[PDB]
Design a protein around this ligand. Structure first.
Ligand SMILES: [Cl-]
Lengths: 103, 100
């Protein structure tokens, strides 16, 4: 309650950053932006940790109306196409989390 | 573009204890940090498949990188960092991000 539902994609460091960045911004993000019910999307470039480098490279937060809507979105043709694309270009780099962003 | 410090916490052994410390002590300490522009707390309620390795995320927004670096070194920033380390250091990953 008193929250907003978001899917969080967290990507670890790619071996080829040029290839990752091209695929992510030119192919993957546009696929994700087609998902019915997606209300907002924020992309965060991870530039380090307080002490140095980070394990993580990129985060994306995708906002939906409610939990049911997120579950339905991931099962649409567009959701499946985005998921399939991520498994191909990012593979094990990707961790997915479901969050409730509190008021 | 906004700069943010991201704190990501893995699953605690005692969720009740984590929650009391986090919400009653830690978040208030963090809200006192000079320069903090916004703070969002996200409960991680699972992954698409079920459980998640992660339990909570906090996003702390600053106007620019220099302000974040200053903020972390204020008395308030240091106290917040030490508090996080004490109650949950083994669970914590800190990241600096640029949100587009
Ligand atoms: Cl993504």
């Amino acid at each position: 309650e008193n929250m907003m539902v978001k899917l969080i994609a967290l990507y670890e460091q790619p071996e080829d950053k040029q290839a990752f960045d091209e695929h992510y911004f030119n192919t993957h993000a546009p696929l994700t932006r087609k998902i019915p019910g997606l209300r907002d999307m924020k992309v965060t470039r991870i530039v380090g940790s307080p002490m140095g480098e980070s394990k993580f490279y990129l985060m994306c937060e995708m906002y939906y109306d409610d939990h049911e809507s997120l579950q339905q979105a991931m099962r649409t043709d567009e959701g499946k196409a985005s998921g399939k694309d991520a498994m191909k270009f990012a593979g094990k780099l990707l961790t997915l989390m479901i969050g409730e962003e509190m008021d």
